[PDB]
Amino acid sequence: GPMEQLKCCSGILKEMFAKKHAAYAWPFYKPVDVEALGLHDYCDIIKHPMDMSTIKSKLEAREYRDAQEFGADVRLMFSNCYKYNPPDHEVVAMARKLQDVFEMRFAK
């Protein structure tokens, strides 16, 4: 049931945090720091920031009622990256790789 689906979601996120994917997942681990150099315009562009640690905290607080809700936040995280950065940016390529990891798990 929903309990089982959410346990699967936790396992997917755990894999996304794993050393195996760390070379391309690390930009997504923590909230974007809008005080860091270069990011002063982030909140002009991104209305709903999202990151893996926030998703983890929401799973722990049981905020997601089902897998679709969890997946929406994962996709929001990637979409923010695709919206904020130029398409040839290195972080966009890293997002695409981590999104592939996610989508193949989430589908199955």
Side-chain angles (χ1 to χ4, degrees), residues 46-107:
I46 297 310
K47 306 223 79 169
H48 295 110
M50 183 62 44
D51 69 277
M52 289 172 54
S53 290
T54 299
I55 296 170
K56 184 173 173 63
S57 74
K58 292 171 77 169
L59 282 165
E60 282 166 348
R62 303 171 80 180
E63 182 161 355
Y64 303 121
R65 298 193 65 210
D66 69 29
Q68 309 312 336
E69 208 181 347
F70 158 87
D73 265 357
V74 175
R75 265 90 165 240
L76 172 58
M77 179 202 60
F78 293 127
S79 294
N80 288 340
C81 185
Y82 304 144
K83 180 183 182 170
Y84 175 71
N85 298 281
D88 63 327
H89 200 288
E90 55 271 26
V91 76
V92 167
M94 295 168 76
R96 284 209 209 311
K97 291 174 61 171
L98 190 64
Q99 186 156 18
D100 180 80
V101 174
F102 166 79
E103 297 286 348
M104 311 289 322
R105 288 307 192 193
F106 193 70

